[PDB]
């Protein structure tokens, strides 16, 4: 076989290279993704709320979203209206209609921010509802979504980047550094 120490060395280079190589992915291909962010931003700046859900492979990312939008030390940031909707009682299982009615009744202005596989018919039904969404999907459930290669080896990195893009965009407009 090949020595681990030589192995790890080669490996480290391809890894970093492949990364640089793909760095442009998002701009190459720039989408409607801007308008989604736009609308989501408007949504949020209008006081609406963000009910975040994720497929079972992306819990770590739901977590990431929650702690990066509202970090332990807020400093002078807003407290952003963000809900871990995965963990919520209203997360649809049997009867999205009740999930949906209750949700509409509890919140003033909810929006669904879902990321990844739609793993049940309950959630499909709600994301197809008329409540505002922010769909980061592997398959275009709907016109207005952000499409993502599921089996991409760099999927995990692009979620950060996109989030980071989203976080920056939202605060750049909240803080009047940019005109939406």
């Amino acid at each position: 076989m090949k020595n681990f120490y030589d192995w790890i060395k080669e490996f480290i280079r391809d890894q970093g290279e492949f990364i640089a190589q793909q760095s442009g992915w998002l701009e190459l291909e720039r989408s409607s993704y801007a308008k989604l962010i736009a609308q989501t931003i408007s949504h949020v700046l209008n006081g609406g709320s963000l009910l975040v859900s994720a497929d079972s492979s992306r819990h770590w990312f739901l977590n990431y979203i929650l702690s990066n939008l509202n970090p332990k030390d807020l400093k002078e940031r807003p407290l952003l209206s963000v809900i871990d909707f995965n963990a919520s009682s209203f997360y649809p299982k049997n009867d999205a209609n009740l999930s949906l009615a209750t949700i509409e009744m509890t919140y003033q202005n909810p929006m669904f921010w879902h990321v990844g596989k739609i793993e049940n018919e309950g959630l499909k039904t709600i994301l197809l509802s008329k409540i505002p969404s922010f769909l980061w999907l592997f398959e275009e459930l709907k016109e207005d979504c952000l499409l993502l290669k599921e089996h991409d080896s760099l999927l995990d990195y692009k979620l950060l980047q996109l989030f980071k893009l989203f976080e920056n965009a939202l605060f750049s407009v909240l803080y009047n550094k940019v005109t939406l």
Partner: protein, 87 residues
């Protein structure tokens, strides 16, 4: 429009408000002489989160600052502040 300008300077010039805080928040605030007068001051903020965050973290600072100064927001030895969204 002149009062506007200058309410902001009292704020800028205040201890418990940092430069970034003035920039990110207070600069975006704007005065409402319709509605204002004179036991209350009305300001507009471009959007809801600003109207809410400002109100939550600086409303008392503004009440304070205002009561402790002359303006054209008169007597009101205790002027109230109310900030809102624009249209």
């Amino acid at each position: 429009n002149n009062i506007e300008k200058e309410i902001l300077a009292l704020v800028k010039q205040n201890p418990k408000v940092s430069l970034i805080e003035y920039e990110n928040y207070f600069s975006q605030l704007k005065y409402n002489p319709n509605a204002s007068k004179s036991d209350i001051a009305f300001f507009y903020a471009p959007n809801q989160v600003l109207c809410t965050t400002i109100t939550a973290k600086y409303g008392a600072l503004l009440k304070e600052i205002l009561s402790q100064n002359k303006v054209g927001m008169h007597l009101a030895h205790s002027v109230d502040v109310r900030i809102e969204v624009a249209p």
